[PDB]
Write a protein that binds this ligand. Structure first.
Ligand SMILES: Cc1cc2nc3c(=O)[nH]c(=O)nc-3n(C[C@H](O)[C@H](O)[C@H](O)COP(=O)(O)OP(=O)(O)OC[C@H]3O[C@@H](n4cnc5c(N)ncnc54)[C@H](O)[C@@H]3O)c2cc1C
Ligand SMILES: Cc1cc2nc3c(=O)[nH]c(=O)nc-3n(C[C@H](O)[C@H](O)[C@H](O)COP(=O)(O)OP(=O)(O)OC[C@H]3O[C@@H](n4cnc5c(N)ncnc54)[C@H](O)[C@@H]3O)c2cc1C
Ligand SMILES: Cc1cc2nc3c(=O)[nH]c(=O)nc-3n(C[C@H](O)[C@H](O)[C@H](O)COP(=O)(O)OP(=O)(O)OC[C@H]3O[C@@H](n4cnc5c(N)ncnc54)[C@H](O)[C@@H]3O)c2cc1C
Ligand SMILES: CCCCCC/C=C/CCCCCCCC(=O)O[C@H](COC(=O)CCCCCCC/C=C/CCCCCCCC)COP(=O)(O)OC[C@H](O)CO
Ligand SMILES: CCCCCC/C=C/CCCCCCCC(=O)O[C@H](COC(=O)CCCCCCC/C=C\CCCCCCCC)COP(=O)(O)OC[C@H](O)CO
Ligand SMILES: CCCCCC/C=C\CCCCCCCC(=O)O[C@H](COC(=O)CCCCCCC/C=C/CCCCCCCC)COP(=O)(O)OC[C@H](O)CO
Ligand SMILES: Oc1cccc(O)n1
Ligand SMILES: Oc1cccc(O)n1
Ligand SMILES: Oc1cccc(O)n1
Lengths: 403, 400, 405
């Protein structure tokens, strides 16, 4: 039919809803739409970062979020053949509160939606699939979406906050400056052994594969086996049995779980892709932000916090434009002009870290020892601060501080 | 006053092997030494696969094994009590190769008993040489005191690293390296351990080296920086015992009866190289008097003995030709230059792993771990242990 | 102000500028090349080249003509660690063809191109002509304003204006261009000394020493030029300590230089070079405008890639302009194809240069392990791929046949 709004946003994920929550708080009619029927449709992680704690306390939101179901992870350890080689406590990085946490996204997103539904100028729809852009007069006017249990949404600003797989990246002719994919992860969950804590963050450098252990919702532990691009098809050929013999040789504590495994149906494959669009704001009334604009690898648990920080900067930029009645393409490029420095700093670190997961004949046996040497450098704590903490709060107007 | 044709000053490994190899050749050979017996001063017990190679070329391997010795098949390196490097010396070459715990006196005496059968061989004890009869630019012999002006065509010095003939001769030290120590002590073999072990440990406080000794007994050398032992003595023995016992918990029994440092022997790991081994006509320097090395790899005894073989071959060649001049003696340094210089350069690279600096001490175990995983470490193993080709000497020097 | 009318306008008569002019002149397009200097000998811009340069020359039937000039081939590069060699590389194994580093100087090569080009009547080159501004009309950049000296003021017009000045570019800011990246972390200190007796002449050597890192290259006239690597801002402190202290440390590292340093009693001999790397965001931004060369994609002086990398951009630029003229399509969309094709190699090189510049650290504990890490990396089973990517080009540049002499 026909709809009217001030700001149109595609997707209600961490970045989309944080932007929608804030923009409504500034007294602008917002619309946020998503295709899934709820927040539980797709699994999208549970771990967070110290940088996330900093952001919430910046807006006076930690107490509200901290009242949810979460488990504070106090440190990260790295092993090599079952012997610890590196330890890092997150509270020695910044004076204020600092810690990782296990906070599932649907828990976090429901907390944001509940706070946002208090405002009457915030509107969220679901099962709403954007399918086209209403670009007219050169500028962008809005989007065309089909709703489920056909409508045109016209707005002054359109923001694309879909995920890696972005439809809004192609309708607006955006171009990628980077396309990295060299590794996989193979995730499975198993019952916590009696000798193990629960709020752990453990990485193992073993003989055959590399393992990452994180807490899972419900007293379980989720493991991830690091593999190369295309090596999983070969693994399945050799059979499940040979996979078990090599895993149990690595981590014998997993003996009890693998007694009841007879197929590759308990494992889930994840592809570690990194991306970067060339120019996020390219057309009038158009912008791109989030993980459709600058994804990163699974290391350090930076993906969600980095996306949320981009939205917060986008809200301040948009707020300045609306008050000044200046929404030209010139004002939109401030998001990239302010986020670029910290997003590219993060991505270059992810490229360095991904070089330690090599499975090559001679490099596989020295990666653990290179890691052990690097972490003993006198100025390694600066890298820790860059990866986990943020030096200064995002400079945005006080109007965004919740009371 | 006694005349001879060859005068060797010192009867160590290098000196004796030169003397025997010349007495068998029908020359008048006299060997001088100062100690009252071969047992007075400790001079090591371990050997390397090059040592077996030298014997089998000389066809004396069977005779040597007839005397007492133990076999040490591999060498292992650990880090915080986990093995990081392993090597078997029998895979380095097709021929049979091993380390031997053959103590020196049971080797020197075996050389003496075999050597004295020849009537032109002569040996003396307590004959401390004092001056050289350097006359007309050449050595007429040596002046000594017994407890003698012995004139010879060649006067070869095998005194050792603490050489007294490095000053009588006007030799110049091309190198002098000294930046580490060792602290030796012997204790009883633990039940869980074996006897024929060659074990090196990278630990938190100190690095240790375990070797066999005395039969059912083990010796351990604690690596310390130069000038650092004088501090452990100033800070008391109680501190030292606790630090060792934390690092190496299986020493708890031996240290329960230790109350002082009088049982600890300080070995100074020195390395040296002479600018020109034979600078004047009539005398030459060979062995550890000229090209000593560090204790790593047990390459010292073989290096000095192999050079004595080179000296004997050249000396016999010169005698057969009757052309014994300055350029003749230089043939020894010309032919041993490649091995002696490559071996020392390796000893300098390994010594760099014994750093005790605040942050380097914790990276050195990791570097060693990486270096052993390189695509070509086995060529370095051969360089350190086995000789690629047999020493080129005429067939007359072999024993049937 | 007197007027001039041409078809293609280029600013600067360095390697990239001159090369592009020659290739455009051969096609029948009127070409004007402008330089501010008296001649090609005014500024000093190095004397070394790369196997990539040989590949580019012979692709256009030019190796023989260049080989006529005076040049000494360099067969290999060595890297030492305390007077001990830790790496060796002969350029002949990189590709099946003939590959090598020469030491041809720039004013020699530039004259070789100049004389060849001026045979075409459509080629014109001016000295002492300095560009001042950009003549933009009707939402386009048509021509420039230049002031000539031995005359007066000139007003050049063309369908295309190309920016081929150096890193210190005026066209960079006259047409407002944006630097995506800029990097500066090190300095080099160059001085020339008489070749010692034992050292050869056609050497390309690098030393990891106790105090400083030394690079030794050949110089014109049987001399040797040496560059000492220093951190940014460390040279001011070095001068404060004194010349006598600086000499003491250098002789410790390289005692072979003792004979040369007797006549050194100040810092007048030394020359300071700043290792700067750049990348222009959008090489083409205004209609009838472009940017190429070190004013676009400068790089650090490691691997001697800078001169050849610019000529690669000029060659692709000549194909870009050629296709537009034959198609009546000199819009911004066609012009942007220059970066769309050059972008890949330029950024691959810039990344390799930042990795290499990490080995020159002078930090208290890092500088003592960099020589050891270099030795570990070069012994990896897959190092030849890096060598091939740093010196040789896998394939020839896909330019038409008309550009072959
Ligand atoms: C398996 C997995 C595990 C992860 N684990 C972690 C972790 O532990 N920690 C962490 O920090 N990050 C993690 N991430 C990354 C995390 O998902 C991102 O950081 C975050 O989701 C980015 O926020 P966003 O706004 O882009 O959300 P999005 O996920 O992009 O939200 C939009 C959603 O809508 C979907 N969509 C696509 N097209 C449309 C359309 N036309 N209309 C509506 N919706 C559409 C998208 O696919 C997406 O699911 C994980 C990701 C994956 C895939
Ligand atoms: C404490 C110690 C432990 C060692 N342990 C080992 C080991 O385990 N394995 C190994 O392979 N190598 C070991 N070595 C090295 C070994 O000593 C040499 O390889 C070997 O001694 C070299 O032989 P040489 O005859 O040149 O020197 P040496 O034989 O050692 O030199 C000393 C000899 O010269 C004689 N002498 C000294 N001064 C005079 C003089 N003025 N006149 C006459 N004769 C004189 C002495 O009586 C003595 O016989 C050790 C060395 C030392 C110091
Ligand atoms: C000290 C030094 C040493 C070097 N050594 C080497 C080496 O060994 N190997 C190598 O491959 N590369 C070397 N280079 C880099 C080399 O100079 C470049 O690769 C090459 O010059 C780039 O070509 P270009 O077309 O940009 O030439 P340019 O040098 O850019 O040619 C244009 C010239 O005109 C000047 N100019 C500035 N403004 C104007 C104007 N308005 N009008 C006219 N002219 C103007 C520029 O400063 C420049 O000198 C060196 C550079 C320096 C500074
Ligand atoms: C020394 C300066 C220049 C020397 C004279 C010029 C001579 C030219 C020829 C020399 C060729 C260089 C060979 C060095 C090998 C090298 O750099 O390998 C590297 C491989 O090793 C790496 O990935 C290392 C990346 C950065 C290394 C940091 C420097 C190491 C030492 C510095 C201080 C110590 C800090 C680090 C602590 C511990 C490190 C683990 C290149 O990797 P890449 O990913 O950039 O490229 C690989 C592929 O081509 C595409 O990705
Ligand atoms: C390993 C996967 C995840 C591990 C645990 C997950 C989460 C925990 C967080 C732990 C933090 C990880 C930090 C690791 C340390 C690290 O990256 O150090 C790096 C080491 O510094 C480097 O430049 C080294 C580059 C990485 C080397 C390549 C990887 C080595 C692995 C095997 C290949 C063998 C190549 C042979 C040697 C190459 C020459 C060095 C610092 O990053 P940087 O590039 O910014 O360095 C600049 C400067 O030189 C300082 O060194
Ligand atoms: C450690 C005391 C004794 C140990 C056991 C005794 C008996 C057994 C013998 C053990 C075999 C020796 C191991 C091999 C290691 C070794 O020296 O080989 C290495 C081979 O390693 C390589 O090629 C990689 C180069 C870098 C690896 C480290 C080797 C040298 C390191 C020096 C200092 C190490 C301390 C680290 C801390 C200091 C900095 C923070 C070098 O020998 P090289 O002759 O090739 O020298 C040339 C140049 O140095 C580069 O190659
Ligand atoms: O569950 C997950 C998946 C990927 C990364 C991470 O930190 N956690
Ligand atoms: O006691 C010693 C001395 C030197 C070498 C070695 O193996 N043992
Ligand atoms: O003299 C020069 C200057 C820059 C780079 C290089 O290789 N040589």
């Amino acid at each position: 039919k026909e709809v009217q709004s001030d700001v149109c946003i595609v997707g209600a994920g961490p970045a989309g809803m944080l932007l929608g929550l804030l923009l409504a708080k500034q007294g602008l009619e917002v619309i946020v739409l998503e295709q899934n029927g709820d927040f539980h449709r797709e699994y999208r992680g549970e771990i967070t970062q110290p940088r996330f704690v900093q952001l919430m306390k910046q807006l006076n939101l930690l107490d509200y979020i901290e009242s949810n179901s979460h488990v504070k992870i106090p440190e990260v350890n790295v092993f090599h053949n079952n012997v610890k080689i590196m330890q890092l406590a997150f509270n020695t990085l910044i004076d204020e509160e600092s810690y990782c946490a296990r906070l599932t996204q649907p828990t976090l997103l429901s907390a944001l939606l509940d706070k946002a539904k208090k405002y009457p100028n915030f509107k969220l729809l679901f099962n709403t699939k954007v399918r086209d852009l209403l670009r007219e007069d050169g500028k962008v006017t809005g989007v065309y979406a089909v709703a489920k249990p056909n409508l045109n949404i016209k707005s002054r600003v359109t923001v694309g906050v879909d995920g890696r797989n972005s439809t809004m990246e192609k309708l607006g002719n955006f171009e990628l400056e980077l396309d990295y994919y060299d590794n996989d992860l193979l995730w499975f969950s198993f019952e916590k052994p009696e000798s193990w804590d629960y709020n752990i963050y453990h990485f193992y450098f073993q003989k055959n594969y590399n393992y990452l252990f994180l807490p899972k919702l419900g007293g379980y532990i989720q493991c991830g086996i690091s593999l190369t691009k295309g090596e999983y098809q070969k693994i399945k050929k050799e059979g499940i049995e040979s996979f078990k013999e090599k895993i149990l040789e690595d981590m014998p504590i997993l003996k009890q779980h693998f007694d009841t495994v007879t197929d590759f149906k308990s494992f889930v494959q994840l592809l570690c892709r990194m991306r970067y669009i060339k120019d996020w704001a390219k057309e009038e009334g158009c912008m791109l932000i989030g993980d459709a604009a600058h994804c990163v690898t699974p290391w350090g648990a930076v993906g969600s916090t980095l996306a949320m920080g981009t939205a917060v900067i986008a809200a301040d930029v948009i707020y300045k434009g609306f008050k000044n009645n200046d929404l030209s393409l010139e004002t939109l490029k401030q998001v990239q002009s302010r986020r670029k420095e910290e997003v590219k700093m993060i991505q270059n670190l992810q490229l360095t870290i991904e070089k330690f997961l090599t499975r090559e004949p001679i490099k596989k046996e020295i990666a653990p020892l290179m890691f052990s040497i690097a972490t003993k450098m006198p100025d390694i704590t600066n890298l820790y601060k860059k990866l986990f903490t943020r030096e200064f709060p995002l400079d945005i107007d006080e109007s965004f501080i919740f009371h």
